[PDB]
Amino acid sequence: TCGDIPELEHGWAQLSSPPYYYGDSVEFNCSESFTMIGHRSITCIHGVWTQLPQCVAIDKLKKCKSSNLIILEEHLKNKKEFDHNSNIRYRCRGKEGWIHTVCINGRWDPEVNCS
């Protein structure tokens, strides 16, 4: 058993019930006014849990920028920079359809590329 579950620096736990065995995982997300970076769960391995996610206040996030290579929606072409949790859809000049991506602190997921 690992033992006593950790906590999130700026988040919370979902469900963590002892004895906390190897292979156990506990979800940790961010409650209110906080993001969720990295993961959203921990794992009991080596007798220790894992690295934990990073609850950021969203204040300290980054503005994802719309690439000029990619094409966004009719609402989103007016957006130069996106805040996190923005699930958008971009496309390439040639892709007649959309891929969809989420602003992850100045990054996209999937990272957009048309070049």
Side-chain angles (χ1 to χ4, degrees):
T1 54
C2 282
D4 182 70
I5 38 64
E7 66 175 288
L8 277 178
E9 49 179 273
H10 294 278
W12 63 358
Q14 286 296 269
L15 182 63
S16 39
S17 311
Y20 301 116
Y21 279 97
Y22 287 76
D24 258 296
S25 307
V26 181
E27 295 183 85
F28 276 82
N29 312 276
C30 312
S31 188
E32 281 291 281
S33 201
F34 292 97
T35 178
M36 186 217 76
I37 297 302
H39 220 80
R40 80 293 304 252
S41 49
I42 58 178
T43 315
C44 165
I45 36 62
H46 288 262
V48 179
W49 297 94
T50 51
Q51 65 291 148
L52 288 132
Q54 185 179 150
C55 292
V56 183
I58 286 176
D59 161 268
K60 327 198 166 299
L61 262 38
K62 291 181 57 178
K63 306 298 290 297
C64 304
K65 187 180 183 302
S66 46
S67 171
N68 202 149
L69 282 301
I70 57 78
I71 297 73
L72 295 179
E73 293 192 72
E74 306 299 73
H75 323 284
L76 293 317
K77 304 197 311 303
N78 311 274
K79 199 80 64 178
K80 60 176 66 187
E81 41 183 275
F82 291 85
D83 295 274
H84 165 58
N85 188 213
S86 180
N87 296 215
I88 57 153
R89 46 177 177 170
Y90 72 110
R91 76 178 187 175
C92 193
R93 54 186 295 201
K95 269 61 177 183
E96 185 62 87
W98 306 90
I99 300 76
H100 300 205
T101 175
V102 184
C103 175
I104 305 300
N105 301 201
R107 200 193 184 188
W108 289 112
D109 189 87
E111 292 187 278
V112 311
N113 186 89
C114 184
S115 47

